[PDB]
Design an enzyme around this catalytic site. Structure first.
Site, PDB file in Angstrom:
ATOM      1  N   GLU A   1      -2.203 -10.060   2.348  1.00 38.68           N
ATOM      2  CA  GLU A   1      -2.268 -10.709   3.651  1.00 38.68           C
ATOM      3  C   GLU A   1      -3.600 -11.393   3.928  1.00 38.68           C
ATOM      4  OE1 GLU A   1      -2.006  -6.661   4.865  1.00 38.68           O
ATOM      5  OE2 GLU A   1      -0.787  -7.010   3.050  1.00 38.68           O
TER       6      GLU A   1
ATOM      7  N   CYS B   1       0.839  -1.189   0.000  1.00 34.07           N
ATOM      8  CA  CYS B   1       0.000   0.000   0.000  1.00 34.07           C
ATOM      9  C   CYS B   1       0.883   1.252   0.000  1.00 34.07           C
ATOM     10  CB  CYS B   1      -1.093  -0.053   1.097  1.00 34.07           C
ATOM     11  SG  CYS B   1      -2.196   1.394   1.075  1.00 34.07           S
TER      12      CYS B   1
ATOM     13  N   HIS C   1      -3.649  -5.372  -0.169  1.00 32.93           N
ATOM     14  CA  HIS C   1      -3.210  -6.107   0.999  1.00 32.93           C
ATOM     15  C   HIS C   1      -3.408  -7.606   0.750  1.00 32.93           C
ATOM     16  CE1 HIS C   1      -2.889  -2.956   4.254  1.00 32.93           C
ATOM     17  NE2 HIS C   1      -3.644  -2.221   3.440  1.00 32.93           N
TER      18      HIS C   1
HETATM   19  N1  LIG Z   1      -3.815   0.771   3.460  1.00 36.32           N
HETATM   20  C1  LIG Z   1      -2.790   1.605   3.557  1.00 36.32           C
HETATM   21  O1  LIG Z   1      -1.657   1.209   3.821  1.00 36.32           O
HETATM   22  C2  LIG Z   1      -3.088   3.074   3.327  1.00 36.32           C
HETATM   23  C3  LIG Z   1      -2.065   3.802   2.435  1.00 36.32           C
HETATM   24  C4  LIG Z   1      -2.400   5.293   2.184  1.00 36.32           C
HETATM   25  N2  LIG Z   1      -2.536   6.053   3.469  1.00 36.32           N
HETATM   26  C5  LIG Z   1      -3.713   5.453   1.337  1.00 36.32           C
HETATM   27  O2  LIG Z   1      -4.744   5.911   1.880  1.00 36.32           O
HETATM   28  O3  LIG Z   1      -3.599   5.026   0.169  1.00 36.32           O
END
Ligand SMILES: NC(=O)CC[C@H](N)C(=O)O
Ligand SMILES: CCOc1cncc(-c2ccc(C(=O)NC3(c4csc(NS(=O)(=O)C5CC5)n4)CC3)nc2)n1
Ligand SMILES: CCOc1cncc(-c2ccc(C(=O)NC3(c4csc(NS(=O)(=O)C5CC5)n4)CC3)nc2)n1
Ligand SMILES: NC(=O)CC[C@H](N)C(=O)O
Ligand SMILES: NC(=O)CC[C@H](N)C(=O)O
Ligand SMILES: NC(=O)CC[C@H](N)C(=O)O
Ligand SMILES: [Mg+2]
Ligand SMILES: [Mg+2]
Ligand SMILES: [Mg+2]
Ligand SMILES: [Mg+2]
Lengths: 483, 483, 483, 483
Positions: free
Chosen positions: C455, C366, C453
């Site tokens: 995960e 991310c 993600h």
């Molecule tokens: N899920 C995250 O790691 C958020 C990453 C970043 N703050 C966004 O809003 O894209």
């Protein structure tokens, strides 16, 4: 009188008796005369019928009262000599009320828990608090009341209802309540959990008391986040959430309470007109390097305590080796610097013959004297005077040359007077001259047997001489001590 | 055995004993042998020390047990003769456990409420249920257990915990629980309120029982909206919410339970192999028009009950006029068709002299015999045989020409044998010939004094002959009855 | 449907989610389709506002639901894909009832907790249990309901009252209740204490449920004396007191439940028509000897889980080194066999530049993609399709040559399309072609950044390919795996 | 501010609102500015969806708040004009906390009942207490808080937990708690029973409040023996056990509280800087001899109250004859000295045609105006200004010659402007001139219809003019009153 109630939460084994005895010796160090009372919500009248496996050892009082070991904690910390009615039980109180009813003393009214049982609790607590339990005829100032059990047990409900009322039938200046609760720590995370304490305080508050102190017992010291949760959800200030963690010895537990400022709290709350030894003994205990290995042939708590008093007084660590006498048992008995054969109500004769023939130091207590007399040939309850038959005896030197001692007995058998002429010297007897109550074997550094239990007389400041003699002998130092 | 627990909610005076006695005579009418036990959570052993103001009269059993009046309800409804251990009290159970502890019977284990007190309750309830309490040596089938108090009282907590366990240590086929609760009705609206019953059922359910029947007692019959609320919030079907309203007599209370279908419920639930008199006596009671005014010179419950049995047997309504004997009292005593001087433990002598001189019918009981002997001149507890000294006596005709009677005594004084030769005829005596136990005055329609309490022998089907004789005399009909 | 409620006692951290997920995969191994529901008594609607410090990480569902990590436990054990309404909260239910009230749906009746909130709980639990949560359109057979909190918390009272009713509004064949409770073990004695479990079972029983199983969690296995106390005082048979002690891994927790015979209990109780992998993975985990040290630059639970799946799949132990990115941190980063820069919402750029310049394996997730793009130059929520822009990409080989992947996104920022022409290859994009969603740096064994993600897609049987790629690269084996 | 909590025990219908309003007008007579708040533990936001059968009538506030009738009791006793947020409900508070969570205002923390709901209660109670609810901009001195329900209901648990905390987060000088409890009286004995009050005080005390006053409501005055039991078992002095029995009128209920000395208690406790009308109106009410029989064609509480204010102001007793409009109904309607057709949301047209043709006095309210317009031819919520179209109107004379009135509306239909030209005079309209809001029929002593509900404006000291006009007309006295 000023009253300090100590209630338990979550689990009974958290050391409430050590907390109660600690705040007792704190206030004693502040010059106050402290009584203690223990409430045991059990229906047993006395501990004389208990197995030493159930509630630990049966501690014996001077008046012949047989009680659980927590009265011995009060004696050992405070240097008081309790009376049997400093133990309150449900059995003692219900039998009192029942016997009052059968005398007509309740005037044809229906007897019920509130008021009559709750008033019996209050009457008892008022009156046994006023009893001089130090040797001073000067009436006490504080009474610490350990309420045994955990709040929430049905057995304990008469007592907390009594203490709810006893707040109001006294003054806030004269009554405070300690809640001792477990803060469990998870192995997976190290997270210390407050939810037991929160739930247990809610129960106590539902029963019309409230914590004036919350004492967390914990494995590690509690973090500030955990104390914030407790002070919020238990509705008590940060200064009123005290942490006692695992430490080296009971000697350190008063010192933690000083460091957590309980004397400031009790000065303010209880309106009181207000250690060294406890630090010294704790610091000694942590610095012990020499070992004395004694073969003991919570079932033997006062015995272990008396050994550790004696051990600390000669700056040795005790490696207490407990051995079931029916029996690696003989391996332990080979590295025995002394044999201790305590009391009970046959296989012990292995260790006594071993001790006699190999000249390894021996202390026999009660049964151990009887068995030693038997081996060499091959109720009387509470304080009694035992007179010495000579001044050429090791125990008379140890006790400071005194012609008699007064020690606590608990035995129903004794040596036959007619058979003593067959004889090992019988060194102490009763004033009647009938019972022999101390033996010493002369052809030995230290082989003594005593009828009495000198454990119950042991206190850190003055180790039990028969137990001291054993540890001196087990380290050769007896020959120096008598010289 | 099959067990029926009856628990109370809100308030004790709702008639639980009348419910328990009603379901007992229902099941007796269904041919079942019913035992009863009463639990009284009071710590009093026996009622022998009670004032008759506290718990009502002291009812006396054949074995010499002095108990509260609800055992008399069980006798009067079921026609059983209870034993003293059919009364269970906290005092009796705690003293049992305490005495077991002191015998060593708990084998060095700690005695506590659960298990030991709860097991004592179960042991007692199992064993006294098996005791033949009808004259048949044939062991009972059902035991009704009235749990006195209200659930939520601390005194009652050992018993409900015992009964929680007794469900599981029996079978559902063998244990049901009635909850009797108040449905209060507001004066302003007529609105019947269910919230007490909901809260009391929640308490009972929190203690691990549940209502198998909810019995609403109410002033008016409960409306269907009120029964819907109860069946919803108490989690029980409509058929399991029974309404007993205010009615004419206790005779009608079994009949309401038939009409609310409890026999169908108990047949299904308890797996049972399954009145007239109760309707007849209720219908009679509502149709009584003639009045008999008796001067009585819950303190005198069995006395009042015995009069009302007698009154119903001669189709008169009783206008019972209670008079404090220290004393409008003499106005009542002028319209007295009979004087009843009951027992107690001096101003009564006014009414006895009045009765003697004006030839107004008299029954003296216990103290009333002693005072009558004294006036004319101016513990023995439980069932005893009293022998008649002639067959020319009114009580011997009333009792059916029998040479002796066996009636329940409760007295510590008696007439002096040496003084009887100064004499009013002494008509009945003890078998020893020492105590005179019945007097009759001959120059009078009915002036009798008895040492015994024949009240406790009264049942609707067979009115107490001394009380019947009084009401016959008070209506002139004695001269007819003996003829 | 068959329902299994899992309630907590004493403390929440005892692993109830692992118990609930364990009995779920047991029943799945028995061929049953198992749903799960989690009740969280919190008033928060969704976990999207939570800090990862409070309730652990925010787990993301395919439908865009942001929930606490215990739904991820249900996914990882059972291989189900939950929907947002498989999370029940007090906020979701109270808002439902409130919105129904404002629609008029309660027909001018007063809304209150019982019935309306309790019925909303039941309606929700009935209906979300019926939802196919495996890929089979075939309706489930069992629903495991974890009731979060500890019974006795006020927040949880609506739910236990609902489940009390849900027993009766179902059948015993269709509803069982597990109670998971702490058995604390004292450091001083080794004594395992049952009093918390006894008190917590009493609370649960006071709320009209009862344990069908008691699951002790404990440090050491419980002794038989401790299990006897629990089976007595909690009124449940020995076979219904299960012990889960501390063990090596969560893989072993199902295996303990087999060995404690829960399938026999559930077969009998729930009338059910009834592992290998769990033993294999547990036995592997205990036999791991090679180490992979990954620098992570319960807040990152699914991340750690995905690494450990990957590690076990290559028979390495993970030495996960957590590093606060504001920062011995660089010492850890020197012995980093891989850098993992997870998500969050600046100092991370240290580790990315380090990883790029020293050719140490990198996974950016991310924020780690966004920062990697930024470093090289120096809400979209739930499941979305990400399409690959080539077949010459390491992630496309790892995912099995597929032209797109569907993975769970949670981001509000993205790479600017206008700036990508300044360029590190952008390897994956959204179907719209606007957002770049995967980067790979070519002049490196493994430096990939992903917007999603992956995960939340990880399960033991099928490790998350971006996390697997990292651990393969960190052990050189990536060059072998792609070959 | 000073706070007075009023809690209920046993049953809700005991008159707590009348107690709370009574102690409010007592303190108002002592010169103090009193706010009131009502807590309703229902989840309903507003009473606008309620049936008038459930919670009584829907009372309308000036701001357009639709609430239960107990806010009207506060207005009628205290002469205050409440705002909608002086009603607190569980729905209003849970929706507040939920909406705060969704704004992020709880900063990623888990929302739960304690603290967040309990703090929302406190925040609300602090702030709406400070709101000027008399016409004086001068901030209040006391806030009376009626906690609706009975303590022990699950719905009420957030609020008592809040108030427990609010004791400690204030001072004892600033917070007292009244407990109002039922003392039921048995029909069989006259025995007044204390056990409900004892059990309800125990519950309240278990929730960390305590009675500062216990208010017994009872049928008969409580005997001293009953008050001794309560003062013992509820642990409160005799002076703190107050008895309110059944009396003639609500006017007498303040007077009983003076006579039971609450002003001495509140002076001492709350540290306050401290009737006639209430005695006068009570004494009048008991001495009423003339009857006015009005046909009404707790569902119509403010209507009945407004009639009784009017009746007392002309020294007549009201014989209010309620008639279901679908319909002895016409027998009642023959002895109707006036017809009152209230509001609701067809058979009423019987009574309107009757009233019109036989010249029997008529008041039509809301629907009654609409139906009267319809008969003659054969949401706008809260305070609005209605302007008079002449000074030759009976209502304008009754309201004191004023050109407009401001009265409380609650209607969604109105008269069509286009059809009024077909015409009974339309006498009052809205300021827009569109809606006609008052009609008067000229060829009649009193036939008026109003769109508004002038009931909600009624207070004993100033009877509602449309309701007064009716009772004047029904006794001929209107012709005198306007002259
Ligand atoms: N899920 C995250 O790691 C958020 C990453 C970043 N703050 C966004 O809003 O894209
Ligand atoms: C709230 C309690 O918290 C904690 C926290 N951490 C540890 C302990 C702890 C508990 C028991 C023991 C213990 O029994 N130690 C021994 C001993 C010697 S002397 C004596 N006591 S004594 O004679 O009565 C008199 C001096 C007071 N004890 C050796 C036998 N040591 C430590 N307790
Ligand atoms: C009732 C619980 O009792 C006990 C008793 N003793 C120990 C534990 C225990 C708790 C948590 C952990 C843990 O988190 N271990 C890890 C892991 C890898 S895979 C996975 N879980 S998983 O992917 O959801 C899928 C496989 C199930 N966990 C390494 C991170 N390991 C042990 N729990
Ligand atoms: N106290 C004991 O050791 C008892 C010893 C022995 N059984 C006796 O009764 O004398
Ligand atoms: N039972 C009684 O009436 C008692 C009478 C009298 N006091 C006695 O002891 O004989
Ligand atoms: N308040 C009322 O009486 C309502 C009257 C009518 N139903 C309306 O909505 O106008
Ligand atoms: Mg124990
Ligand atoms: Mg009573
Ligand atoms: Mg927590
Ligand atoms: Mg109601």
């Amino acid at each position: 009188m000023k009253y300090i109630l100590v209630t338990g939460g979550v689990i009974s084994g958290i050391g409430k008796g050590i907390i109660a005895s600690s705040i007792g010796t704190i206030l004693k160090s502040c010059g106050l005369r402290v009584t203690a009372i223990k409430i045991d919500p059990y229906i047993n009248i006395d501990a004389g019928t208990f197995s030493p496996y159930e509630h630990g050892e049966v501690f014996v009082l001077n008046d012949g009262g047989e009680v659980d070991l927590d009265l011995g904690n009060y004696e050992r910390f405070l240097d008081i000599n309790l009376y049997k009615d400093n133990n309150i039980t449900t059995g003692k109180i219900y039998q009192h009320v029942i016997n009052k009813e059968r005398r007509g003393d309740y005037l044809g009214k229906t007897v019920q828990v509130v008021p009559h049982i709750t008033d019996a609790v209050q009457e008892w607590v008022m009156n046994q608090a006023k009893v001089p339990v130090d040797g001073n005829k000067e009436e006490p100032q504080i009474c610490v009341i350990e309420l045994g059990g955990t709040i929430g047990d049905i057995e304990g409900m008469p007592f907390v209802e009594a203490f709810r009322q006893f707040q109001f039938k006294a003054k806030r200046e004269n009554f405070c309540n300690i809640h001792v609760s477990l803060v469990p720590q998870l192995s997976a995370t190290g997270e210390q959990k407050t939810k037991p304490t929160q739930n247990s305080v809610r129960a106590l508050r539902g029963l019309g008391l409230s914590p004036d102190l919350i004492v967390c017992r914990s494995s590690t010291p509690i973090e500030m986040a955990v104390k914030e949760k407790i002070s919020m959800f238990c509705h008590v200030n940060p200064e009123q959430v005290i942490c006692i963690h695992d430490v080296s010895s009971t000697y350190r537990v008063p010192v933690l309470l000083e460091e957590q400022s309980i004397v400031k709290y009790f000065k303010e709350r209880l309106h009181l007109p207000i250690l060294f030894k406890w630090r010294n003994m704790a610091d000694r205990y942590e610095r012990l390097q020499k070992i004395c290995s004694i073969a003991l042939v919570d079932c033997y708590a006062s015995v272990f305590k008396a050994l550790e008093h004696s051990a600390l007084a000669i700056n040795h660590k005790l490696n207490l080796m407990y051995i079931d006498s029916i029996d690696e048992a003989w391996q332990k008995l080979c590295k025995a610097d002394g044999i201790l054969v305590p009391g009970g109500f046959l296989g012990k004769l292995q260790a006594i013959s071993w001790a006699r023939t190999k000249k390894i130091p021996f202390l026999g207590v009660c049964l151990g004297m009887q068995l030693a007399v038997i081996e060499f040939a091959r109720m009387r309850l509470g304080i009694r005077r035992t007179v010495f038959k000579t001044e050429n005896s090791i125990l008379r030197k140890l006790y400071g040359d005194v012609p008699f001692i007064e020690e606590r007995h608990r035995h129903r058998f004794e040596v036959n007077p007619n058979l003593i002429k067959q004889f090992l010297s019988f060194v102490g007897q009763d004033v009647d001259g009938d019972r022999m109550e101390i033996i010493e074997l002369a052809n030995h550094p230290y082989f003594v047997g005593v009828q009495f239990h000198p454990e119950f007389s042991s206190r850190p400041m003055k180790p039990s001489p028969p137990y001291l003699g054993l540890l001196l002998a087990a380290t050769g130092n007896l020959n120096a001590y008598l010289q």
